[PDB]
Assembly symmetry: C4
Homo-oligomer: 333 residues x 4
């Protein structure tokens, strides 16, 4: 594999069509799904030359811990859909690569088991109709050694996935929500309840409006993820990468600002960094690699991404991620 | 049916080619027809998160009455062209859905019969060479219980429909203008004559210039429809959605501002609302549903649109249409 | 024929490939040829409603005489290439339609014969290496009753026509330059020599820079044609329609400002007018009609264009060409 | 051959696929490769009319010597890959055409032999891990009569060429680095070492950031090449032509400013000049001509380019390259 695009084809071959569609699809006409890619492709980097590259490092410090790349594995539900070892395979590879892994509320392996793998586990929270269950999940995650709560705030309910509707897609009975034995819309009061219930940094995932980013900082969030949920929620929602610069300026260092949606290479990581992001999340490509070759597949993906990030940073004259954030960009056609 | 696009294919199958062309076509090279869609697709919404969605409502108050959605059925002539029950089928479905239905001057069922169906009938007026006939139509409409006069102002004469010319399209003899037993260009004097002759709100349909919107308010119009007539009049006329924001700002609450042209989903409705529209008109899709399955087809269309509007509003953090109008947007590529 | 596009296909059928290529082609990669169309298609008109249309007129006064449309036939060399009757057929149709016809320096019928047809003949001048021959042509044109000298200023030499080079295209021996029994670059001194030698208005064709338009007025030109020569001279030259607005503003009524390049409908004429043009030139479509059906073909073309111009003007609320020049426009995608 | 595009097809036929890919390809997804062309195609020239063209000259003075065109042959490694005579064939043709030829550090014929050909040889330098070898190359080049040192500054290491990786491309054993019997990242200290070691003008190739251009002048560079290395280094790097205008303004005559990337015609040369460039480099097309017909092929290419430059300049009203730099441009779609 010399690019992430190699993996998608491999995954399409092995996966049942209905499952590949669940993974690949977006909501409505998939306008926001496509726009995530279009938006990245319009961004060009202005590289710097002739700087010291004797010790190029791709490492960052985030939420108290060192990470090997400015990157984490995005929360993706029911990973046993893509491979028998599911979340355990991905978590093991992420651990080995020094990249944070985000355990899902809807993981098909329990959060305690995934956390036992080690590494840098974060935990993604969906707000539940029974609030006490949501706060219990948070407590479970913290007890199991998760380092951050990624509170998903753009899913008051699931978007309308036309591929899934057309396929009549449903969870195979061999895939379950292992954390349970349903959703409620989250509000700012929900965020406060979570913040008061944990010492872990709370990260609001799915922020797109500048004033929501400001309010996130005021609410005590340790980070936000600028995101339209991979084009899977509001169809017609602006791509996060189009809002990123404005949001980074507005929060003015008040919290970590992550972005996701369409990151498909080290060059894309460089673009996000240059626009001001602390780090990116990567979703579908990690699942392509999992589907294609299990744990070893994800390992290969992360090794490829690591080399592409180092390459891009050096070619752009950046010895550190901090330097990459000070790069300028130019919009193209 | 999970999208409006499902309906168009169904309608293409059942309709004679010449009739589908009458419905689908625009004037000239159909530049303005295509531009209505292109313009909507360039608009992206910036959604808000973490707001109270306990009582999401899609209802609006317009021209004195509550409507179930920020939407009305656009005036479309000769609906018996598409289905034997014609206007009666559409009006019944609209009534049941709580959506205003616009009775046409050129309806293939008399306006009194359509009005007898009940619901929220509006009446669309074409100015006639004999002025007295036009004012008589207005009186008939008011007597029959219509709630608004939609005065079409962008048809001094019909545009050049090249599909119709090439097909040699003509009304089948089983389709007639049931309100009669011809056009004259309307002027601002015509508007005043109508306004003086009725207590009903007068709505000017086909406004695109900012100063025409201003003058509409000065002329005592209760509303305007920002519209290039679905690309069927001036070929090269700007899409209404491109003028909407500027017009909403200029009239500064002085009348209702509706828009139409290319609305094909709840997400499109959200975009129009976010740009400032009070409500939208939907034309061709209603006729697709009518052609495909008569009254039940239109019912299904309106139910689908209702769910898509609620979904879009909630995902964008809007508990009311008023909230949706305060959303910001961003132009994309 | 219901559009100009109908004619092009007809002409492609009947013409030898090499001759159709001479007519259709541009210089270099034909970037400027394509850009003339792209530029027009990006322009949208903001129409006005509810104005008096009782006496819509498409007539203009230009260079002392009334014309039936804001349009003239562009100079096109060697018209016997396209039809046996060549320039005589086109001139007769133009006369009958009340549209000025531009006699070429390189006409395949003598300028005296074409002028004898009557109507509103203009004469297009190429500057010749022997200056006295050029001034003699001007005198001949004036004596024969031509009403304007269209001095072509963007051909110091002919551009590189790759279609012609690839075809090894050459004039058939049955086609000659009937005004003769060669080119020199024109300068501002050449313009002055022409102006001093005639009482006719001098029109500089091929102006694209704003300061060249200013200087044209200072030099005593009665008009200019904003033009990149139909994409046949400098490949990469900006389309005239993209410079038109700026040029109209700069000359501030000091001379007539015409435009050409890609005018293919009445709607296109409306766009040019709305951008400030006094009138347009139409080139290739007139030759399509000539090739397709001789004099009657051109007559049909001009009748179609006349109806399209009236239609567009009325639908845009313009009772006169002057009103059309006060229309606003909006750039689209 | 009537255009450079003719040559590429000829070269594709004769070259082994792996070698054509080495020549044609870029890094990553080849976004920057494509963008070089897209960026040029968006630029339109505003030509001037009616100026004196009695002595049109395409000559420039650069780095102390007259050149026949505002153009030099770009450094391209291992030219024996494309033709048995390799660099000698290209250098001979360039000499005959009065165009500077850039001898590569990785030439497949020694720099002394290529320099012996005569003409205007420049020498391109890659910084070596052993610094003394790099300074020795500089001394060798100066002793052999090279007139400028083109220090490549955008290759701390080679970019990721996915075509090459997929092909498993490697140098055939009959092709060697003839200057040797490896790379180190260059810094501003390296530039200073070179500048102190030679009296020749030092030209920094691969500058894209405005402040790097400023610093180049401060560092004593005699020129820069605004360049993203033909899309072969950082994938996503902005095209040089998009940065050119801003850079020309910032250096304010302090050094020569060259540009490369996608120059494929005399018209493209005119565009670069109009944006402010002193001269352009041309890379891949020279190799197409070499592959297609050896020395005579390159001669034909340079003759074609010379005619296209003269043509473009004259049609734009420019009697000199200096005049061409004062042309205005307009961005299109
Ligand atoms: C199949 C699938 C399942 C997902 N499940 C969740 C989830 O449970 N919670 C969440 O916050 N985001 C979820 N996401 C969104 C991702 O976290 C992330 O925002 C998005 O996938 C990133 O875009 P990318 O896939 O283009 O890299 C899911 C995405 C996909 C494709
Ligand atoms: C077949 C057809 C007939 C129409 N008849 C009328 C009419 O009689 N009066 C009128 O004001 N608008 C008429 N319209 C325009 C619609 O009211 C409306 O402006 C347009 O269709 C909305 O665009 P949409 O079809 O993309 O939703 C007609 C449109 C179509 C397609
Ligand atoms: C075949 C052909 C011959 C032309 N000959 C002349 C000419 O002799 N003198 C001149 O000023 N323009 C000449 N033109 C340019 C036209 O006058 C005019 O600028 C251009 O054709 C208008 O663009 P259009 O063809 O898209 O309408 C010629 C154009 C064509 C296509
Ligand atoms: C096959 C190939 C080899 C190249 N080798 C070098 C090189 O050794 N040193 C260098 O500075 N640039 C090198 N370049 C880049 C060119 O000097 C130049 O920047 C680029 O090719 C210009 O773009 P163009 O090919 O579109 O004209 C090479 C380019 C190609 C295609
Ligand atoms: O986008 C997703 O797939 C999600 O995991 O965030 C979800 F919660 F919306 C979802 C959607 C469908 C099935 C399961 C979970
Ligand atoms: O756009 C229409 O179809 C119209 O109903 O508004 C009309 F009046 F222009 C028309 C056009 C053709 C046939 C009937 C009515
Ligand atoms: O663009 C033309 O075809 C022209 O008529 O203006 C011309 F003079 F450049 C020309 C070009 C080729 C053959 C004859 C005349
Ligand atoms: O871009 C090139 O091909 C280069 O010559 O500049 C190089 F040095 F990067 C290179 C790349 C691959 C093989 C040899 C040289």
């Amino acid at each position: 594999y010399v690019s992430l695009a190699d993996l998608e084809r491999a995954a399409r071959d092995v996966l049942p069509g209905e499952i590949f569609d669940f993974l690949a699809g977006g909501s409505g006409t998939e306008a926001s799904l496509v726009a995530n890619r279009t938006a990245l492709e319009r961004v060009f980097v202005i590289p710097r030359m002739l700087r010291d590259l004797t010790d190029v490092t791709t490492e960052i410090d985030i939420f108290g811990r060192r990470a090997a790349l400015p990157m984490a594995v995005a929360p993706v539900a029911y990973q046993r859909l893509f491979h028998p070892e599911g979340e355990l395979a991905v978590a093991r590879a992420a651990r080995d690569a020094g990249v944070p892994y985000t355990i899902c509320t809807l993981s098909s392996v329990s959060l305690e088991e995934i956390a036992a793998v080690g590494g840098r586990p974060w935990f993604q929270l969906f707000w539940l109709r029974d609030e006490k269950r949501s706060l219990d999940l948070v407590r479970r995650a913290e007890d199991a050694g998760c380092e951050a709560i990624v509170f998903t705030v753009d899913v008051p309910w699931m978007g309308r996935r036309l591929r899934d509707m057309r396929n009549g897609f449903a969870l195979p009975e061999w895939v379950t929500a292992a954390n349970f034995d349903e959703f409620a819309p989250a509000t700012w009061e929900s965020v406060e309840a979570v913040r008061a219930h944990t010492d872990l940094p709370v990260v609001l995932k799915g922020i797109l409006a500048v004033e929501d980013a400001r309010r996130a900082v005021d609410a005590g969030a340790g980070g936000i993820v600028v995101s339209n949920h991979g084009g899977r929620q509001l169809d017609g929602a602006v791509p996060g990468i189009e809002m990123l610069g404005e949001i980074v300026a507005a929060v003015s260092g008040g919290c970590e600002v992550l972005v996701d949606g369409g990151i498909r290479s080290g060059g894309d990581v460089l673009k996000a960094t240059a626009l001001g992001a602390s780090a990116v999340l990567v979703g579908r490509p990690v699942m392509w690699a999992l589907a294609a070759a299990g744990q070893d597949g994800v390992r290969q993906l992360l090794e490829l991404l690591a080399e592409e990030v180092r390459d891009a940073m050096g070619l752009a004259g950046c010895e550190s991620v901090g330097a990459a954030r000070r790069l300028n960009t130019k919009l193209g056609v």
